[PDB]
């Protein structure tokens, strides 16, 4: 329902045609810092549970391979 | 146990060539369509 969704006053939007602009304007040289910024802002909340459960997995397999070992 | 193995890998090679031809075109079309939104600039002047 375009036309009766919201009420916005005094805003200006500028846009270009896709045929008068580049499809990949400075792709790598402006995309690598943003990807590194997002990774630095999110890896401290995503990664440490995965590191702890990798430690849990390795400890479990180490105990399973250490289960009997011809016990004296 | 797997008599289809050679023809399976032949269809896999066909798939890899098909997707290597297709997916750059679809990605370029998506970037071309979304380049209007990714170039949009917004201004707000209250009275």
């Amino acid at each position: 329902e375009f036309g009766n969704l919201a009420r916005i006053r005094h805003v200006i939007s500028y846009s270009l045609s896709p045929f008068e602009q580049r499809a990949f304007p400075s792709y790598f040289s402006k995309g690598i810092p943003n990807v590194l910024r997002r990774t630095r802002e999110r890896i401290l909340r995503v990664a440490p549970p995965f590191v702890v459960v990798y430690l849990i997995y390795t400890w479990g397999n180490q105990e399973f391979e250490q289960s009997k070992r011809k016990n004296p | 146990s797997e008599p289809e193995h050679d023809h399976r890998k032949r269809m896999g090679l066909k798939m890899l060539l098909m997707m290597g031809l297709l997916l750059p075109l679809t990605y370029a079309m998506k970037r071309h369509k979304w380049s209007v939104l990714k170039s949009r600039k917004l201004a707000y002047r209250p009275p």
């Binding site: 500028y14 270009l16 602009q21 580049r22 304007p25 | 600039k41 201004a43 002047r45």
Partner: peptide, 15 residues
């Protein structure tokens, strides 16, 4: 004033 506005420079995106 509507004459006070102008489009920004799109030089980093334009060909």
């Amino acid at each position: 004033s509507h004459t006070d506005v102008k489009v920004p420079d799109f030089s980093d995106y334009r060909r």
